[PDB]
Amino acid sequence: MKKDIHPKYEEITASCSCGNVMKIRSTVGHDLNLDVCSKCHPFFTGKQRDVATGGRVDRFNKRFNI
Amino acid sequence: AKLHDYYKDEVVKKLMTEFNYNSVMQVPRVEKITLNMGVGEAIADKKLLDNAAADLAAISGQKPLITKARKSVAGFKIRQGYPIGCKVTLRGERMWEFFERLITIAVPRIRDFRGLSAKSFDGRGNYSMGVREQIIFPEIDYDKVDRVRGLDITITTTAKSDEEGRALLAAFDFPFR
Amino acid sequence: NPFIRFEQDKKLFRNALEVEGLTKGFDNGPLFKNLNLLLEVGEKLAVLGTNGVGKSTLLKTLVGDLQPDSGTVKWSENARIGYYAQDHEYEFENDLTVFEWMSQWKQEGDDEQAVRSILGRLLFSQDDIKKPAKVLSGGEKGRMLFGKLMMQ
Amino acid sequence: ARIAGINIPDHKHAVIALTSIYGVGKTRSKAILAAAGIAEDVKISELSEGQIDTLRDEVAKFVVEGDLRREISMSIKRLMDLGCYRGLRHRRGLPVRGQRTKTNARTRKGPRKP
Amino acid sequence: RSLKKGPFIDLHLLKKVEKAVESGDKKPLRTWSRRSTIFPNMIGLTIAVHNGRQHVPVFVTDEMVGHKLGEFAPTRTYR
RNA sequence: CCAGGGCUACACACGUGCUACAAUGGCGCAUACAAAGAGAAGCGACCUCGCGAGAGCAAGCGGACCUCAUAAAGUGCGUCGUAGUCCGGAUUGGAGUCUGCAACUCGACUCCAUGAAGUCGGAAUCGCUAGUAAUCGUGGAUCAGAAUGCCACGGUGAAUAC
RNA sequence: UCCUCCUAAAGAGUAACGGAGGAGCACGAAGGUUGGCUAAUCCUGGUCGGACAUCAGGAGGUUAGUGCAAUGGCAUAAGCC
Ligand SMILES: Nc1ncnc2c1ncn2[C@@H]1O[C@H](COP(=O)(O)OP(=O)(O)OP(=O)(O)O)[C@@H](O)[C@H]1O
Ligand SMILES: [Mg+2]
Ligand SMILES: [Mg+2]
Ligand SMILES: [Mg+2]
Ligand SMILES: [Mg+2]
Ligand SMILES: [Mg+2]
Ligand SMILES: [Mg+2]
Ligand SMILES: [Mg+2]
Ligand code: NA
């Protein structure tokens, strides 16, 4: 380093919305609690529920009550 | 560095087993990270470059180097010496810290995430990516900043080929497709 | 002849102050007793008086440098107040050049035009914008304050 | 003073504060206060933070600023690309609910232009 | 919009469609009806809708169920 | 003679009105004061269901008795404390009701959301002399449905005319 | 009046109302010295970014640069800090 030309750098303890406590050295000055980390991100569960938009042919048959 | 220990304890053996290497030092290894952004708009206002420098100093625990134009061009009306971009180089411990705090938290936070592209190597084992939103980093709290200015991440590795780079980055559970 | 024209970022409609009472007298008998008046977005109101009547301290208590002993003033919540103070020496300090001084203002403007142009429109030059703003004298400082008003 | 987007307005009564949400009007807001157990006339500053969490969960069941934008924008994008008559008016920039354009319809056509 | 029950479409349309679906994809259906909504059984057909002077063919996709046959034939032109 | 379409097309201009720019105002609660008129393939109480438009059952009336049909400004209480706002209601998405073979071009109305222009208007121009102007509602003609139009009825109710 | 190339016939010099271009300056650092560095132009990847701004890799190798016109020269750099 170069003798106090950079921002402060101290260890913090951040946690997820389900716990998953982690220690990451960052420049914040106060820890934070956030959403799902890479462990709990639904990019491998709700993929089908993500590409699901559409549907009117079935939405007419429920209307067709006769 | 948790990721450094994970590398030297799992990834080395995994990659030698997967690639049939002769020497332990033949394994591809990531050697540096580069974060930059060429603000472009600094022609008519220098303070925006300083704001960008503060943004990168917050994002990574270093002081950005302000890079000037290499040659003059009349397309965007710039001359030589004009400060245009900002850049930060990370090697070693801070590089591992940024790698972990990117791929474990920052990548999920990007709006409408599907997975980073895998065909985005430069044919020589290196990787590149754009974030398009500086607010996905926890070091930025949506109240200090004034723009949606983005960053370029460039992973420079020892990997001989893009296939080896893909394998090395997938060993770290990189969000590929 | 400099070319100064103060514009308006937002227009006020109903009134500005609606002042009722201040009861402001420094040490002796108050120089004014009630002073209950409005503006209805009026104009001018050129306060006059002799050397020692209290116009500047009234203005200070009106803006917020000082406050009245008893009462209230209250501005319209959307207002924007520019102040050419009686003394302007507490402003021109801290070794700031002309360009940096007039660039420390501005809301969303460019640091090369509209800050270096608002200077040229009032008898200033490329030589001027680099000399320290503290060593200016008199009319130059007054025009600097007028430029700050126009910028704000 | 916080809800999904922002509950910036203080000094406002409870039932009118949540109107700032893009997706809540007045009766929908009136259901938030009455069902969750808060009086209509309460000033926002006087409430506690604990009641806000009860508010935050209750409002989040609706479609709001975060996702109400996509609902309308994609619905129009369907009609625009559908080839329907109602889409063409959205394409051209004309009123779509079968009203007059001979002399009126300045709102859809914007300010008058020669 | 219309009423509680009975989405109203014309017999000389359903009867023609029934023979059309039996054979498969075929020539366009030449009809003069614009007030008949689109039932789910008509997808994949090539019915033609009268516009005042001729018939413009229309292909029924997934989203074309809540609108009548006359909602896809601009009845007058511009420019 | 018939099916569909057009008179509902819109870079623009004009005439006649409606709704507003709000605090002698909006919003919630409660309670008074009218007149005129229509009703037989019509008016429809009461009852229940529906958040509401309405739906089911359905007495009475071809009528100073029954219905349409609770008048609204007002009054009393509370809040809003001067903001494009608790004004304004355009524009649009979704789900609805009813008339009629049929509601896309092209109906009316209700529910949820969205909430624009507009903060007293240039030259110029219009109406009114007393229960008049101003404002607030009600009914009828045509009519399956479809008026801010027209025709009529009543409440409050002024200034000035040297 | 002065500077650079050709005519100038491989030393120097050599004319024409022969063929082409420049100067009447600049710099208190743009000089001295010490330490360090190497260009143009292209390919593949990358948010706005674009045919070319900024970043990383490769090929190329001085086709870059030299306060100013041209000739000679410059990597031990005479070029850039
Ligand atoms: N700090 C002070 N100490 C004593 N008296 C004061 C002070 N400040 C103001 N005053 C009094 O208040 C009166 C009015 O204030 P102000 O300074 O505006 O007077 P002015 O002489 O009319 O104005 P100015 O000379 O500033 O143009 C003065 O005449 C003076 O008597
Ligand atoms: Mg006509
Ligand atoms: Mg010779
Ligand atoms: Mg010779
Ligand atoms: Mg000789
Ligand atoms: Mg030199
Ligand atoms: Mg040297
Ligand atoms: Mg040198
Ligand atoms: Na004074």
Short mmCIF file of N, CA and C in Angstrom, two decimals, chain B residues 43-47 82, chain C residues 106 109-113:
data_model
loop_
_atom_site.label_atom_id
_atom_site.label_comp_id
_atom_site.label_asym_id
_atom_site.label_seq_id
_atom_site.Cartn_x
_atom_site.Cartn_y
_atom_site.Cartn_z
N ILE B 43 -15.49 15.18 -20.39
CA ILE B 43 -14.96 16.23 -21.25
C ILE B 43 -15.41 17.60 -20.75
N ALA B 44 -16.70 17.74 -20.43
CA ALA B 44 -17.25 19.02 -20.02
C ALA B 44 -17.39 19.16 -18.52
N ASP B 45 -16.98 18.16 -17.74
CA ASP B 45 -17.08 18.25 -16.28
C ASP B 45 -16.09 17.26 -15.69
N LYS B 46 -15.07 17.77 -15.00
CA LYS B 46 -14.06 16.94 -14.36
C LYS B 46 -14.55 16.28 -13.08
N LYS B 47 -15.50 16.91 -12.37
CA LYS B 47 -15.95 16.37 -11.09
C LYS B 47 -16.60 15.01 -11.23
N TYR B 82 -6.23 14.08 -21.98
CA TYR B 82 -7.51 14.27 -21.31
C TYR B 82 -7.83 13.05 -20.45
N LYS C 106 -23.72 25.58 -8.36
CA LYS C 106 -24.34 24.88 -9.48
C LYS C 106 -25.01 23.59 -9.02
N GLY C 109 -24.72 21.14 -13.59
CA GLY C 109 -24.10 21.91 -14.64
C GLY C 109 -22.73 21.35 -14.98
N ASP C 110 -22.19 21.83 -16.10
CA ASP C 110 -20.90 21.36 -16.57
C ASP C 110 -19.78 22.22 -16.01
N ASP C 111 -18.68 21.57 -15.63
CA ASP C 111 -17.52 22.25 -15.06
C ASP C 111 -16.63 22.89 -16.11
N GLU C 112 -17.11 23.07 -17.32
CA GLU C 112 -16.35 23.81 -18.32
C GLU C 112 -17.18 24.89 -18.99
N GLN C 113 -18.48 24.67 -19.17
CA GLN C 113 -19.39 25.69 -19.67
C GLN C 113 -20.55 25.83 -18.70
#
